[PDB]
Design a protein around this ligand. Structure first.
Ligand SMILES: *CC(=O)NCC1CCN(S(=O)(=O)c2ccc(Cl)cc2)CC1
Ligand SMILES: *CC(=O)NCC1CCN(S(=O)(=O)c2ccc(Cl)cc2)CC1
Ligand SMILES: [Cl-]
Ligand SMILES: [Cl-]
Ligand SMILES: [Mg+2]
Ligand SMILES: [Mg+2]
Ligand SMILES: [Mg+2]
Ligand SMILES: [Mg+2]
Ligand SMILES: [Mg+2]
Ligand SMILES: [Mg+2]
Lengths: 10, 229, 229, 10
């Protein structure tokens, strides 16, 4: 696991 | 541009079809064309723009990381050559986004939402360049990223509730910048924890139309903190 | 071509890197370049060629089906225009494959394996054109598909054991042609059932180095038969 | 479900 950034939604 | 003859509304319509078809390069092309008509983007249109280009550059970053891993694991010219080909492509997409942001989208007026989102977007795509940059260009890219995130942070703290999804997503992405690009693990943990704690303290500010987005980012903040501790 | 200056072995190497990176357009481009050097492809290289182009055209077919479904579900010009753009792209990829097959790969000499595989490949990509074709071109595409599959079938029955994966995969794909393109459900069920039954009857002919491929296709034959009955 | 054709392997 690396750092999680903002995902895509809708 | 190749979209110059198409009506803005048809461009928006087609970007939505391309999203449905998972044609994210087309989707990105349609949205660029829409942006170049010179009118402001609504919230839904900003999401189309964001989703399209993040999907494009996401596939490129994932490709680059596989090839970089192979390259270092073997440290002929083939792996380095192919890695540079993907890297050059990735930089070209980031330049396209950053150019749209400067030529068209980033303005002094308009929504706080819109102004924060584009500065966050500028921060992200400089961060993507910073992931593949070296030397006399790296620290200059890192500072353009930090500078854009910081302006977005100042505005968001002044003008948005602490559960606003743009404010949260920005803070998440700045903290990822701190931890992975700036190598400031303390700043990362301190920004992420503050952002999450202030979000819970003013939990009542959740919006009816975006609370699912807000609570998702809050969880991702907690995921990063668990990872980083 | 854009790959004309690159050594064949570097082209093969880079197609393998692109497969690892899930860059299937690049992978397809590298393999086209390898094919154009004019030497025969090994089994591993044929798999690279097959995997790359099937991945490209697979994404295009899936896109086309979403847009076609939307188009018929609404029966402005936007959906039809965008569907034709994807359809034109898909046809261009199929023409590229079929051109490589005719200009370089399909020959009278060489392996039965190699000769069956390329005729199967010619059958598949005509079938992909047949999926999006209409009218004064449809039945002509359907017959080029049938004709290529049939030649591959004659050779495979004569020269390959009934569990050979190319022979099985060919038979699976011909039966899909029968059921979906030719609208001959009986021929489809009859070919699939014979292929599966003859495979089990001579189950002892499984090869040490391809039996996983063989037993996978046998199961897919049984999946189609269950669906079709 | 539509008809299944040959998949990609390795
Ligand atoms: C309404 C609006 O201005 N635009 C929609 C935006 C899409 C991009 N985001 S974000 O990248 O900040 C984000 C935030 C939260 C989640 Cl779950 C995904 C993306 C801002 C809003
Ligand atoms: C060894 C050789 O000649 N080529 C490898 C080929 C790849 C494509 N196949 S196939 O499309 O017939 C097939 C068959 C079975 C499975 Cl599980 C996948 C693909 C022939 C061999
Ligand atoms: Cl290259
Ligand atoms: Cl179009
Ligand atoms: Mg207009
Ligand atoms: Mg470079
Ligand atoms: Mg409170
Ligand atoms: Mg050579
Ligand atoms: Mg057409
Ligand atoms: Mg027997």
């Amino acid at each position: 696991q690396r750092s999680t950034s903002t995902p895509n939604v809708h | 541009g190749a979209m110059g003859s198409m009506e803005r509304a048809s461009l928006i319509q087609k970007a939505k079809l391309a999203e449905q078809a998972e044609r994210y390069e087309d989707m990105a092309a349609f949205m660029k064309g829409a942006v170049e008509k010179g009118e402001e983007l609504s919230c839904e249109e900003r999401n189309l723009l964001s989703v399209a280009y993040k999907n494009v550059v996401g596939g490129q970053r994932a490709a680059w990381r596989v090839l970089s891993s192979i390259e270092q694991k073997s440290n002929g010219p083939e792996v380095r050559e192919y890695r540079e080909k993907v890297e050059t492509e990735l930089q070209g997409v980031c330049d396209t986004v950053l150019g749209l942001l400067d030529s068209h989208l980033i303005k002094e007026a308009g929504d706080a939402e819109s102004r924060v989102f584009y500065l966050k977007m500028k921060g992200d795509y400089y961060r993507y360049l910073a992931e593949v940059a070296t030397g006399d260009d790296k620290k200059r890219i890192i500072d353009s990223a930090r500078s854009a995130y910081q302006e977005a942070m100042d505005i968001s703290k002044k003008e948005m509730p602490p559960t606003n999804p743009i404010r949260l997503g920005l803070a998440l992405n700045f903290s990822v910048f701190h931890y992975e690009i700036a190598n400031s693990p303390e700043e990362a943990i301190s920004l992420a924890k503050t952002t999450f704690d202030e979000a819970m303290a003013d939990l009542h500010t959740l919006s009816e139309d975006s609370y699912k987005d807000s609570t998702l980012i809050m969880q991702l903040l907690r995921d990063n903190l668990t990872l980083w501790t």
